[PDB]
Amino acid sequence: RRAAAAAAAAGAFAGRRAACGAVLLTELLERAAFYGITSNLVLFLNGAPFCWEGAQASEALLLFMGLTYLGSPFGGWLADARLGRARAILLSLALYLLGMLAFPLLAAPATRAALCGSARCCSPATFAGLVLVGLGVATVKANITPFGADQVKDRGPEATRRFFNWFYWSINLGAILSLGGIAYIQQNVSFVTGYAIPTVCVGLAFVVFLCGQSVFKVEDVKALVKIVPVFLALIPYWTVYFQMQTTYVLQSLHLRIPEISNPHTLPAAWLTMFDAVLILLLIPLKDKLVDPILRRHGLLPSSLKRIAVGMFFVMCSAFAAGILESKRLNLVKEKTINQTIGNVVYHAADLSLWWQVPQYLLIGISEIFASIAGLEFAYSAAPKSMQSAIMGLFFFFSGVGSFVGSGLLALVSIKAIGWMSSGNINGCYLNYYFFLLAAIQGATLLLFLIISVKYD
Numbered sequence: 166r167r168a169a170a171a172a173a174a175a176g177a178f179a180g181r182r183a184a185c186g187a188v189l190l191t192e193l194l195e196r197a198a199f200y201g202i203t204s205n206l207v208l209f210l211n212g213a214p215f216c217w218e219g220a221q222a223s224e225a226l227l228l229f230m231g232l233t234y235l236g237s238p239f240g241g242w243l244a245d246a247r248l249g250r251a252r253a254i255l256l257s258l259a260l261y262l263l264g265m266l267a268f269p270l271l272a273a274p275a276t277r278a279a280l281c282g283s284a285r286c287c288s289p290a291t292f293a294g295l296v297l298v299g300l301g302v303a304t305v306k307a308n309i310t311p312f313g314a315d316q317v318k319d320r321g322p323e324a325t326r327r328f329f330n331w332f333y334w335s336i337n338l339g340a341i342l343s344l345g346g347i348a349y350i351q352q353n354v355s356f357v358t359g360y361a362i363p364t365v366c367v368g369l370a371f372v373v374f375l376c377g378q379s380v381f382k383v384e385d386v387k388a389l390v391k392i393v394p395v396f397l398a399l400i401p402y403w404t405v406y407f408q409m410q411t412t413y414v415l416q417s418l419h420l421r422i423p424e425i426s427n428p429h430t431l432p433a434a435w436l437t438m439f440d441a442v443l444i445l446l447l448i449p450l451k452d453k454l455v456d457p458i459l460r461r462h463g464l465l466p467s468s469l470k471r472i473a474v475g476m477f478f479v480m481c482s483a484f485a486a487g488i489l490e491s492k493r494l495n496l497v498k499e500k501t502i503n504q505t506i507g508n509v510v511y512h513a514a515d516l517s518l519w520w521q522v523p524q525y526l527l528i529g530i531s532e533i534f535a536s537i538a539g540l541e542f543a544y545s546a547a548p549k550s551m552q553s554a555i556m557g558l559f560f561f562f563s564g565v566g567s568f569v570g571s572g573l574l575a576l577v578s579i580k581a582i583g584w585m586s587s588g589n590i591n592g593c594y595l596n597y598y599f600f601l602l603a604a605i606q607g608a609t610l611l612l613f614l615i616i617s618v619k620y621d
């Protein structure tokens with residue numbers, strides 16, 4: 166009946182298989198370039214060409230990340246009022262490539278003198294490149310997601326749900342490619358070759374759109390004022406999610422990591438790969454085991470209950486992380502070993518890294534539910550005219566959540582609490598931090614359930 170009809174719609178893509186693969190490939194390349202920049206920015210800035218202090222490099226990276234969130238609402242407005250989505254994304258990609266071209270030249274010893282030969286050694290060029298890259302990333306992110314779903318929007322609301330699955334899958338594949346290959350070359354072979362590859366990725370991503378150009382009011386005021394509270398209630402979700410991104414890697418550094426060979430010192434960025442490594446293996450499987458199974462039974466059809474399920478699994482992951490951290494802190498009092506990651510030696514307990522697998526499943530399932538469904542809700546529950554501007558607010562509130570999470574981490578590090586009073590974390594109670602994150606996620610779950618019920 167109706168179910169049969171919806172399953173038939175799931176039979177999507179169909180005619181438009183080109184128009185989509187082009188968007189998927191473009192997003193893959195863009196994410197590869199972004200993760201190539203973000204993974205080893207601090208090591209580049211604190212090295213031989215640049216004598217920046219660690220605090221200066223951290224502030225520079227923080228400003229670069231903050232720009233990519235602040236520019237999203239303005240990038241979306243530019244793509245709706247003055248230009249089209251295609252032209253806006255093309256201009257953003259051109260600016261992104263222009264900012265891209267700066268880093269290889271600085272890395273190259275011959276061309277460094279031309280740019281900044283004669284505190285911060287080369288602040289103007291680096292800041293201009295980072296500003297251009299941030300604006301390009303912010304404009305691409307706020308516009309690629311609604312542009313991609315535009316092709317599959319005719320076949321009902323079931324095709325835009327399947328597209329947002331292979332979009333996230335392509336994002337994570339690009340993350341794996343960038344953090345595995347490019348991040349390896351940037352630290353082992355050379356920075357020139359490690360930064361030339363993402364520039365080539367940006368160049369290829371620009372060609373794909375040029376090749377694929379041939380195949381691509383009170384009510385809305387009410388919609389705006391009705392969807393603003395839902396976005397506001399999602400700030401604690403991002404607050405917890407980014408803190409889990411950071412502290413999970415912090416814990417992984419202090420856990421027994423096996424060696425691969427007999428180029429040395431595997432990059433620390435590889436650890437982040439773990440999370441995305443799950444996501445790939447989940448997204449096809451899930452799709453199948455969710456597209457029939459959860460559709461013919463009429464289970465969990467809305468995009469907000471899926472966010473609630475994602476929050477539940479986030480809380481479960483926080484609790485598992487707290488348990489593992491308590492075990493690690495109990496074990497570390499007996500003996501400790503030293504292992505080198507990059508150019509720094511961490512003191513780690515003799516507890517295997519793979520014991521961290523149960524954590525990354527629970528958040529991974531969360532990113533199966535909360536991450537995709539958030540984009541689906543942002544796309545569907547938005548006025549037709551202001552599409553790609555509501556996504557701007559979505560990605561801006563994500564940045565607000567990230568910054569308030571950084572502030573929360575700074576809060577528990579004061580002398581009064583002392584949870585994070587000190588690269589060694591053997592003297593820091595990360596388990597209490599994980600339990601606090603779990604409590605925050607539970608309160609967010611309850612508040613979001615109330616908000617979702619009121620919204621519907």
Ligand SMILES: *[C@@H]1O[C@H](CO)[C@@H](O)[C@H](O)[C@H]1NC(C)=O
Nearest residue numbers: 501502503504510511512513
């Ligand atoms: C760990 O590092 C400390 C400081 O260098 C050193 O004294 C200790 O012997 C190291 N332990 C091992 C097993 O290398």
